[PDB]
C-alpha cells in the first residue's frame, strides 16, 4: 500500500519532520485509495 | 560573596580529599581512615562505600583525568589505573597487585547484574559441584547478592553502583571459571554468563604474571587460541602489522572485530578470527573489517552478536591490576603528579626512584630511573653558594607543550637538597621522558633551577607544581618544612627542542599568616567567570576557602569555616563542572556546596527581511553536546561500539557524523526482566544550555499488528502513574501518544519531544538533568514491543544579537506577533509589499511556533488555541496566496504548516472543526484553480483537499 519511504535526514533536526511525514503518508494513502478504487470496480 | 547552598554530613571520622567525575556526575570523597565514598552529583546520595588498601595503614588519594577519562587511586605502596565499566568504577580491586603463587588468596570484584546471570546459570543450567571450592563460591555469591539487595532498594543510582566481591584462592577460581565455560560450551546455547566467566578467567590470567604465556607475534610461532578471547591480546597481536598506513585496516577496528595477526610464509598480513576461524589475507585499504567479517563468515556468532567468549577492551582496561613503582614492594611513594600531559603519570619514592607510567592505553611502565644527588648541575648550584649531599623529592608534574619536529614532553620534580656547611636548599629539576645537538637520554637531568633566597632562609619546600590553562605560565606552591608559605609564578621557555624555564620568576606572593597556609588548590577554566590568567581557589589551614585571581594574586572572595555543633576547618575543595558548584570538605566530615554568584524586541519592530532573518536564526537548531551522562534500568543495556561502527566507520567515528551518532545513545531491552512498565531514563547534561527539542527513536515488534496505548513523557530533575503525579509540575512536555510519533512504516518511529515550557524553562541556567518516563496504558506486554530506544538532545543555534531568550519568550508569548505574522502573509500589509522570500521567512518562523506549541500538548494551551483561532480567521487568504500566487516551495512549507495544524487540532479541544474550515477555505478557492501560476502549488492544494474532503464530501462533489 506504501510505495515511498526514506525521508531526508536533514529533516529530523528540524521540528516539522512529523508534518512532512504526515504529508508523505497522505500522498501514499490517497494513491493507494485511488488504485484500490480502480481495482475494486472489477 | 560565595553562598553556601546546603550541607550534609558525609562521614563521622572526617574527610581528607575530594575528586569529581563529570561523565558520571559523581564526587569521590576520601575519609580520614582511607575509605572512598561515591556520592551522586545532584542528589548527594552515597552511591558506594568501599575501603581501599594494598597494605594496612596507608592513606588514600584519588584523582580523575578528563582527557583519558580515567581515575587514579594512590595509596602508600601501589598506584594502578582503572576506568569506567558501563557506568561504574570498580574500586575494591583497584589497588590489587598480582600474586606470586597459585595458592595465594585473590580478590575479585564483580558488578551485580552479571553476577546475577552467573548465579542463574550456575543454578538453573550448569552442574559444577564436583569441582573443589564450588560451595564456598556459591555461598560468597549468595551472601554478596543478599547484602546488596538491601542497598539496591534505596535508590536506583545506588543500585547500579554496587559490586559483589569474592575472596578465594586463585586455583579455585580458575577451576570454577574453566568448569563454567566448558559447561557453557557443551550445553551450547547463547547464555549471557559465558562472556562473564570468560572475563573472570581473563582477569585471573592477568592476576598472575607467570600464568601469562609469552606473545607469539613472530614468523613460525603458533599463537594459542585460548588467549584470544580477550580484545587486548588481539590488540597486541598487531605489533608487526605491515598496513599501519591503511585507513580501515588499523589494529583497533579489527582487533575490535575479532581478528588477530598470525603471520606466515604465505602472507605477512595474515589474519583469522578467534571464534569462527575464517582465514583472510591480502588486505586492501578499502576493506572495512566488520563488513569483511560479515561477508566471509555470516554464520559467525560474533558477527551475529550472540554471547561468545569475547572479553572486550573495556572490561580489561577497567580491571587492570595495580603496579608497584618498585619491584620489592616495601617502598613508600613520596609524591605523585599529573600535569599538562594527561597520558602520562609519574610517582616518586623516598630515596629518589621515579617511575613514569603511560595511562592512555593499558597501564604499563614507560620509564624508570633514580635521581643522582651528585649530578653536576646540582653540584654547580652548590658551588655557586660559596661533603654529604642528600636530596628528597616533594612534588611531581609532567609537562606538554600546547599545540620540522615537535618538542618532547618533560618531567618536573620538586627537590629538597640537604647538605652540611645542616642546611636545606629547595631546587627544581627538569628531566627528559620520551625515547629517541646531543639528544638527552630519558631520565637525564636537563635543568636544575635554584629557588630564590627567601625559600632557603625560611627553610621551605615545594608543595605543589601545577601548570596553568594557557600553557605559558606555571604556579609553584611553597610551604614550611612562622611564615604561611609562598606562591611563585614561573614562565616556561619554548625557544628550543626541550621545554625549559626562565630563572627569574614573574610573580611572588607571600603568605604572611600561618593560618592561611595552603592545603588544597584547584584551577578553574576561564570560561566560567566570563559572565587574565584564570582563577584559583585555595583552602587554608585556618579553614578559609579563598578565590584568587591568577594574574595579580588578589583575594576575590573568602568563605569562613562552619562551626562545630570550635570551627570545622575546610580541608580540600573540588569544582563540580556538571553542576557549576564547588564541593568543599571539612575535617568533621561535612561536605559544603558553594555557588559562585529596556530591550528592543524584534517582534515589536516592523517586519522587513533582516528582522525575519533574525527570527529564523532564533528558530534554528544544532547538536548540543558530545555526550550527556545517562544511566539505565538494568533491563536496558548500553550498546556496544560495534553497532556504532556499523552506523559509521572508524575515521568517520571521530570529529565527523560519528560524533552526530554518539550524541545518540542506543539502548536495547531484554525480555527476562519481570516489569515492562514504568521505565525511567534520567538524562544528565554535562553543561546547561537552552534546549530546542529532544529526540526519541524506537523500533516496534514486527509480529504485532496494532500498537496498544503507550505514553512517553519528558520531566525535569528537580529532586534526583504516581511517578508522573508527584512530578506533574516537573513535566516539560506532556504525555504524548506513541503512535503519533510512529513512522509510515509501523516497525520504526521517531518521537520529537518539546514544549513552550521547554524553550521558556532555561531561565537561570538551572535545568542540569532531564527525565524520560515511558508507560504502556492497559505474549508482548508493556515496552516489550520496543526492542530499541534512542535519545538525541539538541540545542538552539547561537545568534549574534543580544538577549536571545527574552525575544524567544516574547515570540512564544505574544498573540499579536502571531497575528502580524499571518497578516503579512495574507499580503494585506498597510506598509510596503511583502516579497515571496519574506513570505517564506514568515512561514519558517510561524511553523516553528506552531510546531513548538503543537508538540507541547499541555492542558491549558492558550498559545495553541490562540494560533489556531487566528489561522481560522484568515484561512481563505493563506490558502489563496500560498497555493495560487507563490511558488511550490512556499506552497510546500504552507502544506506542512497546515498539516501540522491538522495534527495539533485533535489535541486542542477544537469546538469548530479545523478540517471543516480548511475544506471551506479550499472550496472557496476552487474558482481560482485555472488562474494558478505553478503546478506544484496546485498539487499541494489538491493534497490538502484530499484529506479534508473526507469530512464533507458533497462540497467537492458539486464543486469538483
Amino acid at each position: 500500500v506504501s510505495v515511498s519511504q526514506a525521508l531526508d535526514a536533514r529533516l529530523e533536526v528540524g521540528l516539522e519532520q512529523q508534518a512532512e511525514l504526515m504529508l508523505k503518508m497522505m500522498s501514499t494513502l490517497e494513491a493507494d485509495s485511488i488504485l484500490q478504487a480502480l481495482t475494486n470496480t472489477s | 560573596l560565595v553562598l553556601r547552598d546546603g550541607c550534609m554530613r558525609c562521614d563521622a571520622d572526617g574527610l581528607h580529599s575530594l575528586s569529581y567525575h563529570p561523565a558520571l556526575n559523581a564526587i569521590l570523597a576520601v575519609t580520614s581512615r582511607g575509605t572512598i565514598k561515591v556520592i551522586d552529583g545532584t542528589s548527594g546520595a552515597t552511591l558506594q562505600a568501599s575501603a581501599l588498601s594494598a597494605k594496612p595503614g596507608g592513606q588514600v588519594k584519588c584523582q580523575y583525568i578528563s582527557a583519558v577519562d580515567k581515575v587514579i587511586f594512590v595509596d602508600d605502596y601501589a598506584v594502578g589505573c582503572r576506568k569506567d565499566l558501563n557506568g561504574i568504577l570498580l574500586l575494591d580491586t583497584a589497588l590489587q597487585t598480582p600474586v606470586s603463587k597459585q595458592d595465594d588468596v585473590v580478590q575479585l570484584e564483580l558488578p551485580v547484574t552479571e553476577a546475577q546471570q552467573l548465579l542463574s546459570a550456575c543454578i538453573e543450567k550448569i552442574d559444577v559441584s564436583s569441582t573443589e571450592g564450588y560451595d564456598l563460591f556459591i555461598t560468597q555469591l549468595k551472601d554478596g547478592l543478599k547484602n546488596i539487595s538491601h542497598e539496591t532498594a534505596a535508590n536506583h543510582k545506588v543500585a547500579k553502583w554496587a559490586t559483589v566481591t569474592f575472596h578465594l584462592p586463585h586455583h579455585v577460581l580458575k577451576s570454577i571459571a574453566s568448569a563454567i565455560v566448558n559447561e557453557l560450551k557443551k550445553i551450547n546455547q547463547n547464555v549471557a554468563a559465558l562472556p562473564v566467566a570468560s572475563s573472570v578467567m581473563d582477569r585471573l590470567s592477568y592476576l598472575l604474571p607467570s600464568a601469562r604465556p609469552e606473545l607469539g607475534v613472530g614468523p613460525g610461532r603458533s599463537v594459542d587460541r585460548a588467549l584470544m578471547y580477550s580484545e587486548a591480546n588481539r590488540r597486541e597481536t598487531f605489533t608487526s602489522w605491515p598496513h599501519v598506513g591503511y585507513r580501515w585496516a588499523q589494529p583497533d577496528p579489527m582487533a575490535q572485530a575479532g581478528f588477530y595477526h598470525q603471520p606466515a610464509s604465505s602472507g605477512d598480513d595474515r589474519a583469522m578470527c578467534f571464534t569462527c576461524s575464517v582465514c583472510l589475507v591480502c588486505w586492501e585499504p578499502t576493506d572495512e573489517p566488520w563488513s569483511e567479517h560479515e561477508r566471509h563468515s555470516p554464520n559467525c556468532p560474533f558477527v551475529k552478536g550472540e554471547h561468545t567468549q569475547n572479553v572486550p577492551l573495556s572490561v580489561t582496561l577497567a580491571t587492570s591490576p595495580a603496579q608497584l613503582p618498585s619491584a620489592d614492594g616495601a617502598d613508600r611513594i613520596a609524591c605523585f603528579g599529573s600535569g599538562s600531559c594527561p597520558q602520562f603519570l609519574a610517582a616518586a619514592t623516598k630515596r629518589g626512584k621515579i617511575c613514569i607510567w603511560d595511562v592512555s592505553k593499558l597501564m604499563k611502565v614507560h620509564l624508570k630511573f633514580e635521581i643522582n644527588a651528585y649530578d653536576p648541575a646540582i653540584v654547580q648550584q652548590l658551588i655557586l653558594s660559596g661533603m654529604e649531599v642528600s636530596l628528597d623529592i616533594t612534588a611531581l608534574s609532567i609537562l606538554q607543550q600546547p599545540e620540522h619536529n615537535i618538542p618532547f614532553p618533560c618531567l618536573l620534580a620538586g627537590g629538597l637538597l640537604t647538605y652540611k656547611s645542616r642546611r636545606t636548599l629547595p631546587v627544581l629539576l627538569l628531566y627528559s621522558i620520551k625515547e629517541s645537538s646531543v639528544f638527552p637520554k630519558p631520565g637525564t637531568l636537563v635543568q636544575c633551577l635554584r629557588l630564590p633566597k627567601f625559600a632557603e632562609e625560611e627553610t621551605l619546600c615545594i608543595d605543589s607544581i601545577t601548570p596553568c590553562a594557557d600553557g605559558i605560565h606555571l604556579l609553584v606552591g611553597l610551604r614550611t618544612c612562622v611564615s604561611g608559605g609562598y606562591l611563585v609564578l614561573y614562565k616556561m621557555n619554548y625557544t628550543t627542542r626541550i621545554v625549559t624555564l626562565e630563572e627569574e620568576p614573574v610573580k611572588i606572593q607571600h603568605i604572611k599568616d600561618p593560618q592561611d597556609t595552603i592545603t588544597s588548590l584547584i584551577l578553574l577554566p576561564p570560561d566560567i567567570l566570563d559572565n587574565t590568567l584564570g582563577h584559583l581557589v585555595v583552602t587554608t589551614q585556618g579553614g578559609y576557602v579563598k578565590v584568587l585571581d591568577l594574574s595579580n594574586f588578589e583575594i576575590l572572595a573568602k568563605v569562613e569555616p562552619p562551626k562545630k555543633e570550635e570551627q570545622d576547618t575546610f580541608v580540600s575543595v573540588i569544582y563540580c563542572s556538571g553542576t557549576d558548584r564547588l564541593c568543599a570538605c571539612t575535617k568533621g566530615g561535612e561536605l559544603h556546596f558553594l555557588q559562585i554568584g529596556g530591550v528592543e524586541l524584534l517582534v515589536d519592530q516592523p517586519f522587513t527581511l533582516e528582522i525575519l532573518t533574525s527570527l529564523v536564526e532564533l528558530t534554528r537548531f544544532e547538536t548540543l553536546t558530545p555526550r550527556f551522562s545517562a544511566t539505565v534500568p538494568p533491563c536496558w543495556v548500553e550498546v556496544q561500539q560495534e553497532q556504532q561502527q556499523r552506523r559509521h566507520p572508524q575515521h568517520l567515528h571521530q570529529q565527523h557524523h560519528g560524533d552526530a551518532a554518539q550524541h545518540t545513545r542506543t539502548w536495547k531491552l531484554q525480555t527476562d526482566s519481570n516489569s515492562w512498565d514504568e521505565h525511567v531514563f534520567e538524562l544528565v547534561l554535562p553543561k546547561a544550555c537552552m534546549v530546542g527539542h529532544v529526540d526519541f527513536k524506537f523500533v516496534l515488534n514486527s509480529n504485532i499488528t496494532s500498537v496498544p496505548q503507550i505514553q512517553v513523557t519528558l520531566l525535569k530533575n528537580k529532586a534526583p502513574c504516581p511517578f508522573l503525579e508527584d512530578h506533574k509540575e516537573d513535566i516539560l512536555c506532556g504525555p504524548v501518544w506513541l503512535a503519533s510519533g510512529l513512522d509510515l512504516s509501523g516497525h520504526a518511529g521517531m518521537l520529537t519531544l518539546t514544549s513552550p515550557k521547554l524553550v521558556k524553562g532555561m531561565a537561570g541556567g538551572k535545568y542540569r538533568s532531564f527525565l524520560i518516563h515511558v508507560k504502556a496504558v492497559s505474549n508482548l506486554r508493556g515496552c516489550d514491543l520496543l526492542q530499541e530506544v534512542s535519545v538525541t538532545i539538541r540545542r538552539f543555534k547561537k545568534t549574534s544579537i543580544c538577549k536571545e531568550r527574552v525575544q524567544r519568550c516574547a515570540m512564544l508569548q505574544f498573540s499579536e506577533f502571531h497575528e502580524k505574522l499571518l497578516n503579512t502573509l495574507c499580503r494585506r500589509s498597510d506598509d510596503g509589499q511583502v516579497t515571496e522570500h519574506a513570505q517564506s521567512l514568515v512561514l519558517d518562523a510561524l511553523c516553528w511556533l506552531a510546531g513548538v506549541h503543537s508538540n507541547g500538548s499541555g492542558s491549558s494551551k492558550e498559545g495553541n488555541e490562540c494560533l489556531l483561532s487566528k489561522t481560522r480567521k484568515c484561512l481563505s487568504d493563506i490558502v489563496r496566496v500560498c497555493f495560487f500566487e507563490a511558488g511550490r516551495s512556499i506552497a510546500h512549507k504552507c502544506a506542512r504548516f497546515l498539516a501540522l495544524c491538522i495534527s495539533n487540532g485533535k489535541c486542542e479541544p477544537c469546538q469548530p472543526g479545523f478540517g471543516s474550515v480548511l475544506l471551506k477555505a479550499l472550496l472557496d478557492n476552487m474558482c481560482f484553480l485555472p488562474a494558478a501560476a505553478t503546478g506544484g502549488s496546485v498539487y499541494w492544494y489538491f493534497v490538502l483537499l484530499n484529506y479534508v474532503k473526507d469530512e464533507d464530501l458533497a462540497g467537492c462533489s458539486t464543486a469538483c
Side-chain angles (χ1 to χ4, degrees), chain A, chain B residues 6 12 14 22-23 26 29 34 41 44-45 49 51 54 56-58 67 78 80 87 94 98 111 115 121 133 144 153-154 159 162 169 177 179 192-193 195 197 209 211 213 216 218-220 226 232 242 245 249 251 253 255 257-258 263-264 267 271 285 289 298 301 305 312 318 321-322 325 327 329-330 334 337 339 342 346-348 352 373 376-377 386 395 402 407 409 413-415 426 440 442-443 452 455 467 469 471 477 484-485 505 514 525-526 534 542-543 557 561-562 578 584 588-589 597-960:
Chain A
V1 285
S2 58
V3 293
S4 303
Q5 293 194 6
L7 61 83
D8 49 350
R10 286 164 70 260
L11 185 64
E12 55 94 16
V13 67
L15 183 62
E16 314 164 358
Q17 190 259 10
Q18 305 295 295
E20 186 161 301
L21 203 55
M22 185 179 288
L23 284 196
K24 193 93 155 173
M25 171 282 258
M26 193 146 279
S27 61
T28 56
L29 174 79
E30 192 75 89
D32 169 58
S33 176
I34 61 170
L35 180 77
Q36 205 194 125
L38 301 202
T39 314
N40 202 6
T41 301
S42 181
Chain B
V599 179
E600 291 283 15
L601 302 154
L602 269 291
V603 298
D604 292 2
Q605 315 311 316
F607 301 113
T608 82
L609 282 72
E610 292 87 4
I611 296 89
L612 298 175
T613 315
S614 178
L615 295 182
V616 299
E617 286 286 16
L618 289 73
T619 68
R620 204 60 51 64
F621 290 155
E622 53 192 4
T623 66
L624 190 150
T625 192
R627 187 148 281 190
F628 58 102
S629 179
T631 81
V632 294
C635 57
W636 296 96
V637 295
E638 178 44 61
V639 66
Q640 308 172 2
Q641 191 211 3
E642 176 64 23
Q643 164 84 7
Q644 165 80 7
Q645 297 295 323
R646 304 191 322 126
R647 302 164 190 238
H648 296 101
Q650 182 51 243
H651 193 286
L652 294 178
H653 183 274
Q654 293 289 286
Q655 298 304 121
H656 291 171
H657 289 250
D659 280 354
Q662 62 95 39
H663 312 317
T664 318
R665 314 298 305 283
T666 300
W667 291 351
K668 289 190 173 185
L669 183 63
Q670 283 74 239
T671 65
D672 43 359
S673 289
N674 175 60
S675 302
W676 292 271
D677 204 59
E678 192 195 320
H679 295 285
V680 176
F681 307 109
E682 69 275 16
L683 296 175
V684 176
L685 277 296
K687 64 202 151 303
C689 45
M690 61 295 298
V691 172
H693 68 287
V694 297
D695 298 357
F696 212 58
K697 295 188 283 186
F698 52 91
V699 175
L700 277 296
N701 197 293
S702 175
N703 303 357
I704 190 162
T705 68
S706 59
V707 192
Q709 304 179 358
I710 304 172
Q711 295 291 337
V712 189
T713 63
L714 183 63
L715 283 71
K716 78 194 285 290
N717 192 48
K718 190 170 182 177
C721 70
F723 182 76
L724 282 173
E725 175 196 301
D726 182 58
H727 294 88
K728 67 182 291 294
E729 75 286 338
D730 291 332
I731 62 170
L732 282 294
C733 178
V736 299
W737 281 118
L738 183 63
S740 65
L742 200 53
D743 186 74
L744 61 95
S745 299
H747 304 74
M750 191 285 258
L751 261 173
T752 299
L753 298 198
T754 187
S755 67
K757 201 206 256 180
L758 184 46
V759 298
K760 306 178 307 178
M762 186 64 72
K766 309 171 182 177
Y767 292 171
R768 299 302 163 106
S769 171
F770 293 157
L771 277 296
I772 297 170
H773 179 273
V774 291
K775 194 262 178 166
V777 176
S778 53
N779 282 357
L780 278 299
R781 291 156 299 238
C783 295
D784 198 21
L785 283 72
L786 294 174
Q787 281 85 13
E788 191 284 352
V789 76
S790 286
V791 179
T792 289
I793 297 169
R794 320 204 178 247
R795 50 191 284 272
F796 280 99
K797 187 182 159 218
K798 180 59 185 180
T799 69
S800 302
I801 60 184
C802 304
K803 272 78 64 179
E804 304 89 3
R805 173 164 174 78
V806 298
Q807 293 179 356
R808 283 190 180 117
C809 191
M811 182 156 308
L812 277 296
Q813 200 210 1
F814 286 172
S815 55
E816 293 179 354
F817 173 56
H818 310 161
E819 195 271 297
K820 284 154 271 313
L821 275 186
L822 61 84
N823 176 240
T824 61
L825 183 61
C826 287
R827 209 170 273 240
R828 320 303 309 121
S829 303
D830 302 0
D831 56 355
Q833 298 180 0
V834 187
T835 78
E836 183 178 1
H837 168 235
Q839 293 181 302
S840 176
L841 266 288
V842 170
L843 278 74
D844 213 318
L846 183 63
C847 183
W848 175 76
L849 293 174
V852 168
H853 40 95
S854 168
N855 202 4
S857 185
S859 175
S860 174
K861 299 298 289 184
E862 320 277 15
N864 189 359
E865 203 160 0
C866 197
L867 191 144
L868 270 53
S869 305
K870 276 74 70 177
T871 48
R872 288 193 303 280
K873 292 163 197 309
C874 287
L875 192 43
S876 176
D877 292 330
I878 190 167
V879 171
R880 167 201 163 177
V881 295
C882 299
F883 298 119
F884 296 88
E885 299 170 357
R888 68 176 186 85
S889 302
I890 294 90
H892 196 321
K893 301 184 180 187
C894 180
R896 310 180 29 188
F897 170 64
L898 271 293
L900 191 142
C901 292
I902 298 298
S903 297
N904 61 40
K906 63 184 290 293
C907 313
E908 197 261 316
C910 198
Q911 196 267 332
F914 195 76
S916 70
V917 66
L918 168 55
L919 183 63
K920 175 192 174 186
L922 300 150
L923 294 174
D924 200 8
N925 281 294
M926 310 265 268
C927 301
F928 320 117
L929 270 176
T934 178
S937 68
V938 181
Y939 157 71
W940 283 120
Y941 174 91
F942 270 96
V943 159
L944 268 295
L945 179 64
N946 276 2
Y947 191 70
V948 301
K949 82 207 176 196
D950 303 356
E951 279 174 30
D952 190 359
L953 279 82
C956 171
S957 303
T958 306
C960 298

